[PDB]
Symmetry: D2
Amino acid sequence: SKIGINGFGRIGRLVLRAALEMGAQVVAVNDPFIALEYMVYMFKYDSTHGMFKGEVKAEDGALVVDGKKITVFNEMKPENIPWSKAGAEYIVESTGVFTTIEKASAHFKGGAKKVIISAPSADAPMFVCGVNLEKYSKDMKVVSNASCTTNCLAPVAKVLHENFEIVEGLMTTVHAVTATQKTVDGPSAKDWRGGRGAAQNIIPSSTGAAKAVGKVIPELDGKLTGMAFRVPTPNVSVVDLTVRLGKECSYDDIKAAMKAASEGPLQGVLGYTEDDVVSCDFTGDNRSSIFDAKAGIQLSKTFVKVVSWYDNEFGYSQRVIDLIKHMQKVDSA
Amino acid sequence: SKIGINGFGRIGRLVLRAALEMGAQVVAVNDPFIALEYMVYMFKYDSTHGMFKGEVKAEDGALVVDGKKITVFNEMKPENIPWSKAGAEYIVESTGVFTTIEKASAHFKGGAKKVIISAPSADAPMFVCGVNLEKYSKDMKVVSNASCTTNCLAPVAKVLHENFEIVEGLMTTVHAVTATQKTVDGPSAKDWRGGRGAAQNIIPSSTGAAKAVGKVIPELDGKLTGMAFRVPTPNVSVVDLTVRLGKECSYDDIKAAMKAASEGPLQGVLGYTEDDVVSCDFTGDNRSSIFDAKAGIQLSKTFVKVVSWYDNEFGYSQRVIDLIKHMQKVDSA
Amino acid sequence: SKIGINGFGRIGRLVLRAALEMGAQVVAVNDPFIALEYMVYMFKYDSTHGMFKGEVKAEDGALVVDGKKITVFNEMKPENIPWSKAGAEYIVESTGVFTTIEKASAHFKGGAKKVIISAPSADAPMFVCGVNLEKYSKDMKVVSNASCTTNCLAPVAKVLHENFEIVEGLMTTVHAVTATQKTVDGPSAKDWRGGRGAAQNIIPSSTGAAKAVGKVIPELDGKLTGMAFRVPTPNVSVVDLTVRLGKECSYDDIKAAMKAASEGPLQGVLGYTEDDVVSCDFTGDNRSSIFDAKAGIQLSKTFVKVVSWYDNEFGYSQRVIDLIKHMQKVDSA
Amino acid sequence: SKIGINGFGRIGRLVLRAALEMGAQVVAVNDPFIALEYMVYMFKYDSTHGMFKGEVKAEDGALVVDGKKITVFNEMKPENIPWSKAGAEYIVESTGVFTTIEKASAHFKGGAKKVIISAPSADAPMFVCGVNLEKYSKDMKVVSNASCTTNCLAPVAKVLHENFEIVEGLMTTVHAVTATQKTVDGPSAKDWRGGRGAAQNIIPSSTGAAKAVGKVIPELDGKLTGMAFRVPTPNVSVVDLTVRLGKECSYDDIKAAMKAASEGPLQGVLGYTEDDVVSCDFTGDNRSSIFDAKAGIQLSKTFVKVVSWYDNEFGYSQRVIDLIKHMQKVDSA
């Protein structure tokens, strides 16, 4: 699908695993810091998701994954990456720093057609698969796939709001550790709690996730907000949404509405389970949000707490490829 | 004080540490399973709270801690413990098994004057220090000190209800691992999620805490309920309380009300901080509930989330001694 | 291959995964404690090794795994398990308690032909695949597959001794946590260090592994001994063998000898790598021992330290099926 | 004492804590990256060693700890720190970057009298308190305090060599995580294993410790070498030393020799225990090396394994202050 990836960090590298897994075609990778023999090692071994089953080798200055030759570039500034040379047209911008339309637009100088920011953007239209893809029009040059917690929250909020109306809600995500955290207490000037030892601590943290759902589902703007607790697990997180509903209902109506949407309009985005699951059961899960039927609780006919799991690395990687596929189809119709 | 302790598990051992920290007097300990020389070792060394500072030895069938002799019994059945033989009068029943009035009364067959269940009871009146100690009357022979999460929830629920009226609240506690969990996946018949590998997993779980607050503050009965997530930390937990309030207010009004209560009627039970704290900052904290001012969020003038920390092992042990000291005052008044 | 498994704990349950994976046929499972709906859950979800990809259901009092109907029994005493009724002939005895020939022999009363103890036996001949299988003769009714650390140590010691002669050696295994450990400091009367919180601690522990290599390779009897440090990882362990050799050599002769044996007589038992591997890279590995070329060190021409990884759960499960296959072939020739 | 500290990372902060614990006087701290109000916070709160007991505030551009004013500089280059301005004379250079005599000499441009590198040095004479302090002469202007693992190895190597003669030794340290590791898999160009997820993994690593002992005890030069395994614990490490000895002996002779040295010439540096200890029992331990008597094993009268614990953050910080106090005595003698 002429995909180029900028950044070979955790998201770039798993977006590449996802593409391979989904039959997609990545033709170029850019990273200023990882050299090609290091790229091979990093792609091949993964402590959370297992060793890549397939051949990964460096051959003539290209990364070669199961025969697929991927051109590698090591440019510092996006404007200088020669995307056109590899034939990379739609590029996943995963560095975390070129996230606004102006900045992401620097990929057009090297011949990119469209840029997909895999992070919240302050101004590029944000998409969540299964919720607002019909808003995408081929004239959008730079889009964003929002965050992995927005991709978990927005499914479950779409179903709750369509059927019972969300009057207001407050969310907590119990989130696995990330790369921005510290093995032992270290400096983190912009977030003091975030520099404290990640394996030792439950750490309060912020999240713009519930805010961003107000952008993906405009009717929920200003009705949701939340926070995060980082806890010592390597991956897979859980949204805990407490919501005041507009229409009286039972918990079995909430379970029935969620099962119905996982079977139809949100098939493959929203999952449904009634088992005694814990977080390791969703390592490698491709869905954006998996509603846990037995964990939620209802205090009253309009006040309830809903629980939804997400593999914060893997489901979001798979959604980046889904948004590119949707985009391509819309741009060639 | 003439305290006796039944059970030498984490609660029993740490109530012995708290007594010694607080000048209270423990004269006998019973455990059917832990022999005297193993008691010396388990009390002396503690992975979370550290080595006991002071001398701990077994001398003539007694446990001697800083010169104090503690008679040791190894009886399976309460009715068989010779409490009067050791001069033990106020028994902390900490095994978790004899929690109703009918079952805890077996201690009177051995000469006990009062029994304090250090766990929730289906029927013994439950106390939270700072919230309802004035309900205690000297004719109550069996009382309960409720649980560590109720001791964290109830102070915060009391200030919120007094000042703004709680209409409805749903609670989550992000809870450190406990002795009932498993190092690797194994059998837990009653609670299948609870048998899954504790260091690997975020584990949904139940909590009666929120329900128990309706017992302690009768006007919150049926207005509150909640759940727990067990996460891989050895100690210290956090209550995440989402509440709809009767009176409109700002978050600064909630902060002011908590600060004031921690300086006055709840001094020593409820703490207040505005620092960038994490859970390891509360290891060894003696207070029942520390309101984290900076972590809460308010969505509207009546819908807010409040975060309060607690060292689930240690604040609770100290409260058991405070409950016994209150009781001995009323009983000899 | 008419296999019956006694015990549905971690080894029993992964021996069943291994059998399915290897085309073997298990016709019965016995466990007194796990009921069939709990067996389905436990087999299906695994925090370390992933969800079973396949259908697992209870159907008419049988566990049915991908069409394979497995009869379940819930007997407390091995003598009473009716193995003959399901046609279970070779039974994997994995409970950890019926480990001597007399005790394991209790399976013959229910019609078992041969018993394979998946633990060290004090008296049943111990086998390690790739090292002493030719010692097996069809008249042996009860054999043992030794332990997962013996299955890692014995390969690597066979190669070192055949080529350079082991004069003496001392081993340390840095071992992942096991089921006998405790989430927080708890009682463990027979091993006080072993009751201390597993996620918090490096814990010295014993191991009979090096002793048992003296039984599998009789020429090394009395020349090896060692110990274990339990550390907070859920699976995959590493042997660190420090050895005084009889013949002068270089580290490159040790690497060459190990590569040669992994390519021929020890193919599939002993692996060889020169990558920058860490323990998660061997989760799911089927080999008994994987020699790490870059981690070992040589001080002198006869004194060296060798490093070998093993997935202490998975490789040993796969070897139990390999020993049964070898046995069957030898018993029907 | 007039101590200055360069760097406010884990070693810098804990050397400030140790000085205050020991009555020593620190008059200035430099860190280019950590601002004064963030210094207050990082010093006050500590996940492993706990909250500082005492008042810590920023007052007029100074860090005031228990009434003591500490002038703060934020200079990138040593030559630019105005050490004489604050009356700082003995500088603990703890950044890890200025470790040779040529690089550490940049501190004299600012008025320093002596520089103590709190890390190994390629050329500054290295000291281990208790082993070779008598080699210090007042003309040495730049010295090194070696590393925390050398401070654990060298006392134990000294008793073993004095009494039985070390012919050959290979060491492994099972080492807690450090600040150079990663919460999740990421880039570590120089050391690929060291970038893999620290809480997930046992990680082979290098150590110069054993080589450095040949510098500190010149007769062990070239007789020792070793490696490290980084494991998921926040602090406290253990040396596993396998040694061939010149003189035949029993393990009881090694125990007796260690016990005697800890009562006499190594009192305070080497500790001795015979309890069932685990690593959390040594958090905050001030000693450099605690011999665990019960964990070692002896194969033959000349081949034994010795286990010694150390709190890699804390014993080392205390030794830096002991080295400075020795130096100030000799310099004013």
